[PDB]
């Protein structure tokens, strides 16, 4: 319905608040890209792609630090169906003063803020996560 | 000068012995007027910031509008705001004349600059607010020359700061290099004047 | 040489003689919110002799003023 990426972010947010360890949801290309990015920056622990003959699903394990500390402290959606947001190469933002990351879809695929500013390319910003 | 009133009054009200060494505060360290030897009152943040502004303004003896203009111009520089403001305040010709030994207070330096008794690079200057640079020299252009007042001022002049070099054979002084906040007043809190101008 | 402006639109009214009306649509940022909004403007084009039919996408090109309000000529008809 309308926005699946917002549903993705809301699922991780709810599971993080509940201190859940495992999450599953239907899969797509952009969902797999977001999960792979989050795994690269270590926000999540692991991600698996389970094959079912409707669309396939993705399962992510939430990662918590020592003494039950939340690794992911917030997810915000920037681009929306009612208002799209596009950022230039010199307009890409720094999430949480460099402590967090942003996801941007540019002409070279999905990248983070560091990759986008390294190649001097721009795209549309999808979300902030910190 | 800007203001020709009593000098012990402003120092006594301010709480510090500016333009001297405690001699204005030897007796009755309380504020002037009939109130102050009786009791006191509380002090808020606004009072402290205004007190620091008065510290600077009556320490360097320059009017309020010129003070704010100098602060604004110092904001143009690069570095910490208050340090740059203070070091630009230290660039005044009056301050250089006073701290160089040619006078004893700010008023004496200001009057001796107004009459053109000094000169920079052989140019008579009647502007006390002239901003000296590195390598600029000072002299007496043989006007006062063998004057009693300048001899007395050189007699009782404490010492010379390490950022200015002066020789008395020809009464020549020049800024060695830029002074730092480390070699400055330190009776003030420069972190409050910026906030006071920030409201 | 130089070049003239070309617009691709859809024929709306072709009931004039040797001339038609074409709507051209484009999107634009808003003044304060930055949202896409449809923006349709109607031009008048000139054909050879009544070829274009209503609801057929056509490309038209700029030219001199042919009439009181007529500044475009038909370049071709892309499809119906």
């Amino acid at each position: 319905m309308t926005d699946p990426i917002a549903d993705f972010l809301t699922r991780i947010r709810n599971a993080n608040m509940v201190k859940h360890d495992k999450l599953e949801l239907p899969a797509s290309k952009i969902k797999k890209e977001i999960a792979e990015i989050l795994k690269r920056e270590g926000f999540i622990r692991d991600v698996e792609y389970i094959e079912d003959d409707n669309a396939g699903t993705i399962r992510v394990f939430l990662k918590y630090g020592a003494t039950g500390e939340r690794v992911i402290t917030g997810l915000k959606r920037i681009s929306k169906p009612g208002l799209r947001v596009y950022a230039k190469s010199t307009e890409v933002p720094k999430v949480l003063n460099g402590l967090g990351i942003a996801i941007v879809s540019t002409s070279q695929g999905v990248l983070t803020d560091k990759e986008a500013r390294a190649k001097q390319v721009g795209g549309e910003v999808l979300a902030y996560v910190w | 000068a800007r203001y020709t009133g009593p000098s012990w009054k402003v120092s006594r009200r301010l709480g510090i012995s500016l333009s001297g060494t405690g001699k204005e505060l030897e007796r009755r360290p309380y504020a002037p007027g009939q109130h102050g030897p009786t009791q006191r009152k509380k002090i808020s943040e606004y009072g402290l910031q205004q007190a620091e502004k008065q510290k600077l303004r009556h320490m360097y003896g320059l009017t309020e509008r010129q003070f704010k203009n100098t602060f604004n111009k110092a904001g143009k520089l690069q570095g910490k705001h208050g340090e740059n403001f203070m070091i630009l305040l230290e660039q005044r010709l009056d301050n250089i004349v006073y701290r160089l030994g040619l006078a004893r207070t700010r008023r004496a330096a200001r009057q001796l600059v107004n009459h053109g008794h000094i000169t920079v690079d052989g140019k008579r200057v009647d502007i006390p607010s002239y901003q000296v640079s590195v390598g600029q020299v000072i002299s007496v252009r043989e006007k006062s020359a063998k004057n009693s007042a300048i001899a007395e001022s050189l007699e009782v002049s404490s010492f010379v700061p390490e950022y200015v070099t002066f020789d008395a054979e020809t009464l020549t002084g020049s800024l060695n290099r830029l002074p730092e906040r480390s070699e400055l007043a330190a009776e003030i809190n420069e972190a409050f004047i910026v906030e006071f101008y920030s409201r | 040489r130089n070049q003239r402006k070309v617009y691709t639109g859809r024929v709306v009214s072709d009931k004039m003689d040797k001339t038609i009306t074409v709507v051209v649509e484009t999107y634009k940022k808003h003044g304060l919110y930055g949202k896409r909004v449809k923006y349709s403007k109607k031009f008048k084009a000139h054909d050879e002799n009544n070829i274009a039919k209503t609801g057929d996408v056509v490309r038209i090109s700029e030219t001199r003023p042919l009439s009181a309000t007529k500044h475009f000529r038909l370049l071709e008809v892309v499809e119906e």
Partner: protein, 156 residues
């Protein structure tokens, strides 16, 4: 040691058949410039007793402020009750710009370059609670790097 400052005192009342009874409630912020600060409330028939009780209360709920390079690492917002305080980093030599209670708590904490704004109600206790709450979700590069299993240079 521990330096303290008085924020506000309020005279509250309660009705009885013989009249009314009043007492003073005092808000006190304590802290040292090393990076530790706290707040407390006291209540007594006399103001100095209220101040002493507020100091004793404030001494029991101390917190810590990350103050890397004498500046907040990144902007944060508090949300306690009906008060809102937004804290953001400032350049060196910019001083501190804040409201009364927020100025007090930031000065006692030890920071020197930070700018804040009040976006909610102006009740002093709620303002202090919002400021402390906003200080809660501060971060350090080393801590998040340890959380994500990488180094500071990789992260920054």
């Amino acid at each position: 040691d521990l330096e303290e400052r008085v924020v506000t005192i309020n005279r509250v009342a309660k009705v009885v058949k013989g009249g009314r009874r009043f007492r003073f409630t005092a808000l006190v912020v304590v802290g040292d410039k090393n990076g530790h600060v706290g707040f407390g409330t006291g209540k007594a028939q006399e103001v100095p007793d209220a101040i002493r009780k507020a100091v004793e209360d404030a001494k029991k709920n101390m917190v810590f402020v990350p103050t890397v390079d004498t500046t907040i690492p990144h902007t944060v917002v508090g949300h306690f009750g009906g008060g809102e305080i937004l804290l953001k980093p400032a350049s060196a030599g910019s001083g501190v710009t804040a409201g009364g209670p927020v100025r007090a708590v930031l000065e006692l904490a030890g920071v020197a370059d930070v700018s804040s704004k009040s976006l909610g109600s102006n009740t002093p206790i709620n303002m202090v609670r919002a400021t402390i709450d906003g200080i809660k979700q501060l971060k350090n590069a080393e801590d998040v790097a340890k959380l994500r299993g990488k180094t500071v240079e990789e992260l920054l």
